[PDB]
Amino acid sequence: EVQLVESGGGLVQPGGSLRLSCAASGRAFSDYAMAWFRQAPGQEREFVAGIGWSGGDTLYADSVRGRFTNSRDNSKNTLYLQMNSLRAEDTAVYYCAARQGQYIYSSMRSDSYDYWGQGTLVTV
Amino acid sequence: QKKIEEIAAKYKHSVVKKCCYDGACVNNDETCEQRAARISLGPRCIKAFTECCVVASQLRANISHKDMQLGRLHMKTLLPVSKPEIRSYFPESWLWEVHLVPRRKQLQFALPDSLTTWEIQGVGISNTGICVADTVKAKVFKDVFLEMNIPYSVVRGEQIQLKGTVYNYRTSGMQFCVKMSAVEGICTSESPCVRQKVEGSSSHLVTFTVLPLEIGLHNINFSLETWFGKEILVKTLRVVPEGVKRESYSGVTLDPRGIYGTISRRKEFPYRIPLDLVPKTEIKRILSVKGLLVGEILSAVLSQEGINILTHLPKGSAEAELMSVVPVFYVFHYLETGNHWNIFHSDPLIEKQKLKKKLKEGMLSIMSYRNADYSYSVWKGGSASTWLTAFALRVLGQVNKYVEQNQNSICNSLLWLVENYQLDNGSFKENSQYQPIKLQGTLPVEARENSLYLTAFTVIGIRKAFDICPLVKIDTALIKADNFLLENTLPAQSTFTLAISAYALSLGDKTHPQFRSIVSALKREALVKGNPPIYRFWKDNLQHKDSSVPNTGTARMVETTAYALLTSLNLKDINYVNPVIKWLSEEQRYGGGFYSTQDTINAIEGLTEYSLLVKQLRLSMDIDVSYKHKGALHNYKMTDKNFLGRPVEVLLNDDLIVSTGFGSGLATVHVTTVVHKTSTSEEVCSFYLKIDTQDIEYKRIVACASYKPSREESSSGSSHAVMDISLPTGISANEEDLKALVEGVDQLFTDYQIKDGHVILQLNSIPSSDFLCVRFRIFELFEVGFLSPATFTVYEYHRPDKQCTMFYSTKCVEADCGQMQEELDLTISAETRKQTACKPEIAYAYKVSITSITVENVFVKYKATLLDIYKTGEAVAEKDSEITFIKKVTCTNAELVKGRQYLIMGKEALQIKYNFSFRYIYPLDSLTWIEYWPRDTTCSSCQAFLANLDEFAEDIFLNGC
Amino acid sequence: EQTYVISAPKIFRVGASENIVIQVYGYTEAFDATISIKSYPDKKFSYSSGHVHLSSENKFQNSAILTIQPKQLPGGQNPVSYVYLEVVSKHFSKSKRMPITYDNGFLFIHTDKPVYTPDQSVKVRVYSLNDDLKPAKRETVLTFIDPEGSEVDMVEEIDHIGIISFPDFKIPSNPRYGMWTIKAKYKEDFSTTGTAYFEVKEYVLPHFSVSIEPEYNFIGYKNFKNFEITIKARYFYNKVVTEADVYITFGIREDLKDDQKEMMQTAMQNTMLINGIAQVTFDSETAVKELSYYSLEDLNNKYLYIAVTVIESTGGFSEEAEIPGIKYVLSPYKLNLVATPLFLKPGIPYPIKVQVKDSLDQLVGGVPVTLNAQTIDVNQETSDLDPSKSVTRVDDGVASFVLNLPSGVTVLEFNVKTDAPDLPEENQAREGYRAIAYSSLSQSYLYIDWTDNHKALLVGEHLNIIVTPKSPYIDKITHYNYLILSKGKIIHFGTREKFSDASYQSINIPVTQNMVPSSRLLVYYIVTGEQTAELVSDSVWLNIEEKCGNQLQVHLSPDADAYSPGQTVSLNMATGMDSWVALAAVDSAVYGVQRGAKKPLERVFQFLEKSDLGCGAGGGLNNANVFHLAGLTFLTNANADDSQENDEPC
Ligand SMILES: *[C@@H]1O[C@H](CO)[C@@H](O)[C@H](O)[C@H]1NC(C)=O
């Protein structure tokens, strides 16, 4: 079993910079697959950014590529999402999600993921 | 057991492992050497058989029955090889149709009657590909249902216990009740529901005792009542008369304009009651009026499929599988050669299609009897036969004209004949121990005769199939064989071998001078009825050896005449063939067949070839069937439009008269009479028979037969024989004992089957010197009281007239037989004796004296003397003539003492007409008054007894009612 | 540098509509190209040809459907083996030797039942489809061969709708018993064959029914000391046998097809059948090891044949029964790889997805798996990697692994084992595997990989594949190119822009109905070289849901499973479009247990994908091998080295 806690979400000006933090409870992350997703109200959840394996693969959505940077501190067991140049299209609840298994590539599919945090709101 | 595994392991290259196996099988009736005496597979098989037989008998001494069973289980495993067989039957599939579905399509039907989990599968095909639909399940299932085990037939008077079972598939036990529907003729000793309980997920037995009083099919219903529902199960009990079924035939050819002989516009089939007729049974007779000489085969096959025309002859031999395709071929041969496909009112092309398909299916039946080297065996798995391979080549060669045969297969079969079983002189020898025919003459002469027949028969087979595979080798063989036939036929020993040699030679060079001499000598033996001849036929014995002329036909009679007819047809001697066709047409049967297999095929070929050689005139006759002293039956206008008219049962008991006006054509009228007789003494018995039942440890039947050689028959024994053992009602045979007698290398019989309550075994030869016995255990299926005897019939397969039939055995008890009055005087008075006599039902009334007792087939016959006549209604009773009476043997209150006088008065009287005399027979029923009559003894109550007897006797004769 | 790529199927199929793709690069404006199939002896004769226009509007890619007409081929017996594939244009002219096959259709023989008794009639029809899975009205010849090898009947029928109904074959009254063969063939043009089997067995009336019930269908380490066997025997229907004698003999069997067997004379004997049921226990160890093999490792994949004869004591009747074989199982699990090509791409992490199934081939979950690996570099210097461990996911049975290898590795010899907490070390499952590195002269490699390896790829959705190359010359690649194949024919083709600022890029692919049975994706890019351009390729296998083009559904009103005999019932058939439908109604009891047999209905999904000329999960030793394993030949001025004499696909 894995519990997941997102933090760092808040209100930001368009153009601003925000860092989201994903805490894992009950697992050490290892080489497991983990991702960030977003959901706007009344809309289906979409992939944002992900990192398969530990640090050797990393995949972003085309909506966010070049603006967002995903990183992992293995020692702290935390995931970080640096978010720059934010727009009104980025306003959403953001959920950290994780997969069971040592997958090189990030799945963009919400059907691939089994553990979900409660989420954190980002308002741009 | 290991002690027997070592023997099998000891002898290499297999082949002989089976010989060891069925040697070690249990046979408490014959020694090892007696069993090995029948082995025909060589010296190597004999030595293993002898070894394993002796050791198995030694081990079974100090052992126990449990030890024996362990040894026989071990043997039946590992030593034989696997065998394809199945313990379950699977019904025919359905819903196999194809439909065009405009996106959605519904079709309705009815589920079959079975307890089956059906699986429905759909496969869609369109321009977008293939779609295997989801398999849908459909369990047709009944949770509560009754089934009854009704026997095939039941003899009248027997008290039968009908057993059944109720099945309960519910998870909870339950109450139920079965009731029986009382039909009028069936007496069940109660004349009316006792509730029983079946446990959950099990079954319960059901039993009902009944006693049929009337002959025929009676609808009897069985109502099963249960809480879930109530079901009625309709069944039919087939009640058969006592004695043997016997079938006689009378034939007449109608040639209204006398084209092929004398005019034939009328014929009278007399109504004649047989001698030993079973009481209270109707004389059945069916009337069949068909359009042509070939008309009987055409109507029988196309309407009721008529696969085998020789239903009275059993299957088992490959000959039967070939005989199954005989009728379809000759019908097809007529329709195609004469171009008569317009007889069908529907599409002729679909009918030509259908008949061609049935021909193919029949031709595949014999492939099983073909060995790897393309020879053919009479019995599946048995030794190859020179005879049957010749016959198969004849049938195949004829069928090849319309349905092409595998040329490579036909070639290999022909070469197997001529390369191995042809002697230096050109004659042929038999490979197997199969003796198809019994011929006359002494031991040297029978050998010469039998060699001639096989050589002539093989020539016929090779000629019919020569064009398929025109090899120089089999042509060279044909030259050598033809030379043998030409040189040795002239010192003939029988018309039979003379005829077959003549037909065989007719298939080759018809210009050889010696052949013409053989035809001349054969023509000299012809018998004729009339001058100018109306009939022409042949007896199978030469005239100079036996000058008596038979009065009825046999299989050999029809077969000799057929060969001569076919010989005559190949020479186109049309003036000579007309009386022969008339005799053969009238010798034909409603069924389409003749007496046996060989006479049948050659006679059908003769009629068909004759029908194709002369022009078939169109048919327009007014055919009327009527009774002499009764109303007219019916009439039909026969034309080329319809001439395959339905048969007609002749129900009334009068003499029949068939007449026609002025007509064109040639129709056939056959009447088959079926009666049931109580005796077999007046039948020619060609076998000494004896049959008994014994108790073992079970019950076992021992039925033995032996051939009775005629004065001119050799002592070599009979030919291919059939032992048909009718089993009594409720008796079932152990199939394991019968299987074990054919399946082994030491086989006593060559084929067995159980068909319709009969155990039918077949045989290569029955000896003349001693008896040969079949032994098989039997068990009781259900209890039967007052068991009526069954029949044991043995006969020669190719000559059914050489036979012998013998009987054997293993409320409502008295069944309208009668009650004898109490002896001496009683309260029944002189005037009560008159009112019973003047009763309109009572025809006759007089006093007789019994002279002799005889008991024949449940029926006691009394020859008596007529003393004083007191009344005479319709039949006459002459003074001091012999009069016969009949009572059921099984009646306690009816018992007559030899030598005593009785006053007997009855209700019926039967007048039998043998067209020369008017013999009278008087039945004994309940309303037949019989009374003891002492001869002048003055006892105490006898003076008064004789007082009242002569009181009644004086008033009866005075015409006082 | 200007390049051209001509893509065609590995083999040309006579009479088939073969789609030929042309994709050129480096060419401007518009120009034309002629595609042609000529005779291998003479390029003068033209079997067919098509004109294709290539422009910027066209993205310089086009397709042409060619057909080798059967009527053009000579009609003497000796078949044509090679043809010439030729492309001619203003700019280039390249030709190639192509093998041909006369296997083009498919013939499914459908008999109503697989087992028959004498005098029954065999209902038989044939579904005949062409290479494009279409009706194809071609006339068909059926031959019937008996168990002794004799052709006993032959019948031909014309085909109108793609379903060919033949007349029923009547089994003789006393026929030759055993295994019969039916052979289907085409009357004029093609060498395609279909084959079906049916047994003819003699019916024998049984006295009672005998059933044998083992504890399990397989024998593991837990039941190697005791194996419970329950032997029941009952009369017809609900009735059951009261008292009997049960005798059981045991044997060892190599395979179920061969009827040879090795007995064990230490058999059990004289048990009691009481009230319908009897029971025994079989000590496997004692019965085998004195009479046969010492260890159970030598018993793996062999079978235990059981024979039972039951002799009822009251009436003396005897009935036999047999169990053909119970497979001895050494390890409760069997391992197999899923969606992992056995090829290494230097610099890219190599993924391994193992899959665990039991003896009934069902995905077992929660199974820990240990992975070991050896590496061999170009210098033959071996290196032993650190072992990794995963646990099997219980949703799909998969246990995933990732391996980081040095850039210089060429061969990876890795071995996988299961680590179950309750299994001894002998009873664990072990499988070894080898992956060889892709060879490239410019140190240029491409790795494609389909992250959706558990979804069925439902038709109508989209396939988001990630194309990751690792190489020099990365930021001079203009585009990526793709070919989608299914059932041995190129169904799609195109090109996607390569982003010069990313390393990986998501390629989106709409999944269509042409892709529904199976698909193969080939992705390649062109690396420009001063001397000559080089093609760097990789391939992946796409398993797609089995969905009908015209879905058929049959229903019964009424819908309950239990019906009564003689009940009038309605069958409702529904299809997406107008379709012919062949129906059948068969007693399910004819199938039961099947030994060495496959149901003819479920036989279609497997017999259809013989037309996929590809094998394995994808990849290859080099560019030419990547194309070959996808069932493709290619023509290029970039690569001179082609596959020599590769007459047939794997
Ligand atoms: C019962 O039998 C009688 C006469 O045998 C007949 O009318 C009927 O067929 C049976 N009853 C039913 C309901 O079938």
Coordinates of all heavy atoms in Angstrom, one line a residue, chain C residues 298-338:
Chain C
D298 N 13.8 -35.9 -13.8 CA 13.6 -36.7 -15.0 C 12.2 -37.0 -15.3 O 11.9 -37.6 -16.4 CB 14.4 -38.0 -14.9 CG 15.8 -37.8 -14.4 OD1 16.3 -36.6 -14.4 OD2 16.4 -38.8 -14.0
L299 N 11.2 -36.6 -14.5 CA 9.8 -36.9 -14.7 C 9.1 -35.7 -15.3 O 7.9 -35.8 -15.7 CB 9.1 -37.3 -13.4 CG 9.6 -38.6 -12.7 CD1 8.9 -38.8 -11.4 CD2 9.4 -39.8 -13.7
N300 N 9.8 -34.5 -15.4 CA 9.2 -33.3 -15.9 C 8.8 -33.4 -17.3 O 9.5 -33.9 -18.2 CB 10.2 -32.1 -15.7 CG 9.6 -30.8 -16.0 OD1 8.4 -30.6 -15.9 ND2 10.4 -29.8 -16.3
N301 N 7.6 -32.9 -17.6 CA 6.8 -33.0 -18.9 C 6.4 -34.4 -19.3 O 5.7 -34.5 -20.4 CB 7.5 -32.2 -20.0 CG 7.7 -30.8 -19.7 OD1 6.9 -30.1 -19.2 ND2 8.9 -30.3 -20.1
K302 N 6.7 -35.4 -18.6 CA 6.1 -36.7 -18.9 C 4.8 -36.9 -18.2 O 4.4 -36.1 -17.4 CB 7.1 -37.9 -18.5 CG 8.6 -37.6 -18.8 CD 9.4 -38.7 -18.4 CE 9.2 -39.9 -19.3 NZ 9.9 -41.1 -18.8
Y303 N 4.0 -37.9 -18.6 CA 2.7 -38.1 -18.2 C 2.5 -39.4 -17.4 O 3.3 -40.3 -17.5 CB 1.7 -38.1 -19.4 CG 1.7 -36.8 -20.1 CD1 2.6 -36.4 -21.1 CD2 0.6 -35.9 -19.8 CE1 2.5 -35.2 -21.7 CE2 0.6 -34.6 -20.5 CZ 1.5 -34.3 -21.5 OH 1.5 -33.1 -22.1
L304 N 1.5 -39.5 -16.5 CA 1.1 -40.6 -15.8 C -0.2 -41.2 -16.4 O -1.3 -40.6 -16.2 CB 0.9 -40.3 -14.3 CG 0.3 -41.4 -13.4 CD1 1.3 -42.5 -13.2 CD2 0.0 -40.8 -12.0
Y305 N -0.1 -42.3 -17.1 CA -1.3 -42.9 -17.7 C -1.9 -43.9 -16.6 O -1.2 -44.6 -15.9 CB -0.9 -43.7 -18.9 CG -2.0 -44.7 -19.4 CD1 -3.0 -44.2 -20.2 CD2 -1.9 -46.1 -19.2 CE1 -4.0 -45.0 -20.7 CE2 -2.9 -46.9 -19.7 CZ -3.9 -46.4 -20.4 OH -4.9 -47.2 -21.0
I306 N -3.2 -43.8 -16.5 CA -4.0 -44.6 -15.5 C -5.1 -45.4 -16.3 O -5.8 -44.8 -17.1 CB -4.6 -43.6 -14.5 CG1 -3.6 -42.8 -13.8 CG2 -5.4 -44.5 -13.4 CD1 -4.2 -41.8 -12.8
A307 N -5.1 -46.7 -15.9 CA -6.1 -47.6 -16.5 C -6.9 -48.2 -15.4 O -6.3 -48.7 -14.4 CB -5.5 -48.6 -17.4
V308 N -8.3 -48.2 -15.5 CA -9.1 -48.8 -14.5 C -10.2 -49.7 -15.1 O -10.8 -49.3 -16.1 CB -9.8 -47.7 -13.7 CG1 -10.8 -48.2 -12.6 CG2 -8.8 -46.8 -12.9
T309 N -10.3 -50.9 -14.6 CA -11.4 -51.8 -15.0 C -12.3 -52.1 -13.8 O -11.8 -52.4 -12.7 CB -10.8 -53.1 -15.6 OG1 -10.0 -52.8 -16.7 CG2 -12.0 -54.0 -16.1
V310 N -13.6 -51.9 -13.9 CA -14.5 -52.2 -12.8 C -15.4 -53.3 -13.2 O -16.1 -53.3 -14.2 CB -15.3 -50.9 -12.5 CG1 -16.2 -51.1 -11.3 CG2 -14.4 -49.7 -12.3
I311 N -15.4 -54.3 -12.4 CA -16.2 -55.6 -12.5 C -17.2 -55.7 -11.4 O -16.9 -56.0 -10.3 CB -15.3 -56.8 -12.7 CG1 -14.1 -56.8 -11.7 CG2 -14.8 -57.0 -14.1 CD1 -13.3 -58.1 -11.7
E312 N -18.5 -55.4 -11.8 CA -19.6 -55.5 -10.8 C -19.8 -56.9 -10.4 O -19.7 -57.9 -11.2 CB -20.9 -55.0 -11.5 CG -22.1 -55.1 -10.6 CD -23.2 -55.9 -11.3 OE1 -22.8 -56.6 -12.3 OE2 -24.3 -55.9 -10.9
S313 N -20.0 -57.1 -9.1 CA -20.0 -58.5 -8.5 C -21.3 -59.2 -8.6 O -21.2 -60.5 -8.7 CB -19.7 -58.3 -7.0 OG -18.4 -57.8 -6.8
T314 N -22.4 -58.5 -8.7 CA -23.7 -59.2 -8.7 C -23.9 -59.9 -10.1 O -24.0 -61.1 -10.2 CB -24.9 -58.3 -8.4 OG1 -24.7 -57.8 -7.0 CG2 -26.2 -59.0 -8.5
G315 N -24.0 -59.1 -11.2 CA -24.2 -59.6 -12.5 C -22.9 -59.9 -13.3 O -23.1 -60.4 -14.5
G316 N -21.7 -59.7 -12.8 CA -20.5 -60.1 -13.5 C -20.1 -59.2 -14.7 O -19.2 -59.6 -15.4
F317 N -20.8 -58.1 -15.0 CA -20.5 -57.3 -16.1 C -19.2 -56.5 -15.9 O -18.9 -56.1 -14.8 CB -21.6 -56.3 -16.4 CG -22.9 -56.9 -16.9 CD1 -24.1 -56.3 -16.6 CD2 -22.9 -58.1 -17.7 CE1 -25.3 -56.9 -17.1 CE2 -24.1 -58.6 -18.1 CZ -25.3 -58.0 -17.9
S318 N -18.5 -56.2 -17.1 CA -17.3 -55.5 -17.0 C -17.3 -54.3 -17.9 O -17.8 -54.3 -19.0 CB -16.1 -56.5 -17.5 OG -14.9 -55.8 -17.3
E319 N -16.7 -53.2 -17.4 CA -16.5 -52.0 -18.2 C -15.2 -51.4 -17.9 O -14.7 -51.4 -16.8 CB -17.7 -51.0 -17.8 CG -18.0 -50.0 -19.0 CD -18.7 -50.8 -20.1 OE1 -19.6 -51.6 -19.9 OE2 -18.4 -50.5 -21.3
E320 N -14.6 -50.7 -18.9 CA -13.3 -50.2 -18.8 C -13.3 -48.7 -18.9 O -14.3 -48.1 -19.4 CB -12.4 -50.7 -19.9 CG -11.8 -52.1 -19.7 CD -10.8 -52.5 -20.7 OE1 -11.0 -52.3 -21.9 OE2 -9.7 -53.0 -20.3
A321 N -12.2 -48.0 -18.3 CA -12.1 -46.6 -18.4 C -10.6 -46.3 -18.3 O -9.8 -47.1 -17.8 CB -12.8 -45.9 -17.3
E322 N -10.2 -45.1 -18.8 CA -8.8 -44.8 -18.8 C -8.6 -43.2 -18.7 O -9.5 -42.5 -19.2 CB -8.1 -45.3 -20.0 CG -8.7 -44.9 -21.4 CD -7.7 -45.1 -22.5 OE1 -6.7 -45.7 -22.3 OE2 -8.1 -44.7 -23.7
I323 N -7.6 -42.8 -18.0 CA -7.1 -41.5 -18.1 C -5.8 -41.4 -18.9 O -4.9 -42.2 -18.6 CB -6.8 -40.9 -16.7 CG1 -8.1 -40.7 -15.9 CG2 -6.0 -39.6 -16.8 CD1 -7.9 -39.9 -14.6
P324 N -5.8 -40.7 -20.0 CA -4.7 -40.8 -21.0 C -3.4 -40.3 -20.4 O -2.3 -41.0 -20.6 CB -5.1 -39.9 -22.1 CG -6.6 -39.8 -22.0 CD -6.9 -39.9 -20.6
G325 N -3.3 -39.3 -19.6 CA -2.1 -38.8 -19.0 C -2.3 -37.6 -18.0 O -3.0 -36.7 -18.4
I326 N -1.6 -37.7 -16.9 CA -1.5 -36.6 -15.9 C -0.1 -36.2 -15.9 O 0.8 -36.9 -15.6 CB -2.0 -37.0 -14.5 CG1 -3.4 -37.5 -14.6 CG2 -1.8 -35.9 -13.6 CD1 -3.9 -38.0 -13.2
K327 N 0.2 -34.9 -16.4 CA 1.5 -34.4 -16.6 C 2.2 -34.2 -15.3 O 1.7 -33.5 -14.4 CB 1.4 -33.1 -17.4 CG 2.7 -32.3 -17.5 CD 2.4 -31.0 -18.2 CE 3.7 -30.2 -18.4 NZ 3.3 -28.8 -19.0
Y328 N 3.3 -34.8 -15.1 CA 4.2 -34.5 -13.9 C 4.8 -33.1 -14.1 O 5.4 -32.8 -15.1 CB 5.3 -35.6 -13.8 CG 4.9 -36.9 -13.2 CD1 4.6 -38.0 -14.1 CD2 4.8 -37.1 -11.8 CE1 4.2 -39.2 -13.6 CE2 4.4 -38.3 -11.3 CZ 4.1 -39.4 -12.2 OH 3.7 -40.6 -11.7
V329 N 4.6 -32.3 -13.1 CA 5.1 -30.9 -13.1 C 6.2 -30.7 -12.1 O 5.9 -31.0 -10.9 CB 3.9 -30.0 -12.9 CG1 4.3 -28.6 -12.6 CG2 3.0 -30.0 -14.1
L330 N 7.3 -30.3 -12.5 CA 8.5 -30.1 -11.7 C 8.4 -28.7 -11.0 O 8.9 -28.6 -9.8 CB 9.8 -30.3 -12.4 CG 11.1 -30.3 -11.7 CD1 11.8 -28.9 -11.6 CD2 11.1 -31.0 -10.4
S331 N 7.9 -27.7 -11.6 CA 7.8 -26.3 -11.1 C 6.4 -25.8 -11.3 O 5.9 -25.8 -12.5 CB 8.8 -25.4 -11.8 OG 8.6 -24.1 -11.4
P332 N 5.7 -25.3 -10.3 CA 4.3 -24.8 -10.5 C 4.2 -23.6 -11.4 O 3.0 -23.2 -11.7 CB 3.9 -24.4 -9.0 CG 4.8 -25.2 -8.2 CD 6.1 -25.3 -8.9
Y333 N 5.3 -23.0 -11.9 CA 5.2 -21.8 -12.7 C 6.0 -22.0 -14.0 O 6.9 -22.9 -14.0 CB 5.8 -20.6 -12.0 CG 5.2 -20.3 -10.6 CD1 6.0 -20.4 -9.4 CD2 3.9 -19.9 -10.5 CE1 5.4 -20.2 -8.2 CE2 3.3 -19.7 -9.3 CZ 4.1 -19.8 -8.1 OH 3.5 -19.5 -6.9
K334 N 5.6 -21.3 -15.0 CA 6.3 -21.3 -16.3 C 6.5 -19.9 -16.7 O 5.6 -19.1 -16.6 CB 5.6 -22.1 -17.4 CG 5.5 -23.6 -17.1 CD 4.7 -24.3 -18.1 CE 3.2 -23.9 -18.1 NZ 2.4 -24.7 -19.0
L335 N 7.7 -19.5 -17.2 CA 8.1 -18.2 -17.5 C 8.1 -17.9 -19.0 O 8.5 -18.8 -19.7 CB 9.4 -17.8 -16.8 CG 9.3 -17.3 -15.4 CD1 10.7 -17.3 -14.7 CD2 8.8 -15.8 -15.5
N336 N 7.7 -16.7 -19.4 CA 7.8 -16.3 -20.8 C 7.9 -14.8 -20.8 O 7.2 -14.1 -20.0 CB 6.6 -16.9 -21.6 CG 5.3 -16.4 -21.1 OD1 4.7 -17.0 -20.2 ND2 4.8 -15.3 -21.6
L337 N 8.6 -14.3 -21.8 CA 8.8 -12.9 -22.0 C 7.6 -12.3 -22.7 O 6.9 -13.0 -23.5 CB 10.1 -12.6 -22.7 CG 11.3 -13.0 -22.0 CD1 12.6 -12.6 -22.8 CD2 11.4 -12.3 -20.6
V338 N 7.3 -11.0 -22.4 CA 6.2 -10.3 -23.1 C 6.6 -8.9 -23.5 O 7.1 -8.1 -22.7 CB 5.0 -10.1 -22.1 CG1 4.0 -9.1 -22.6 CG2 4.3 -11.5 -21.9

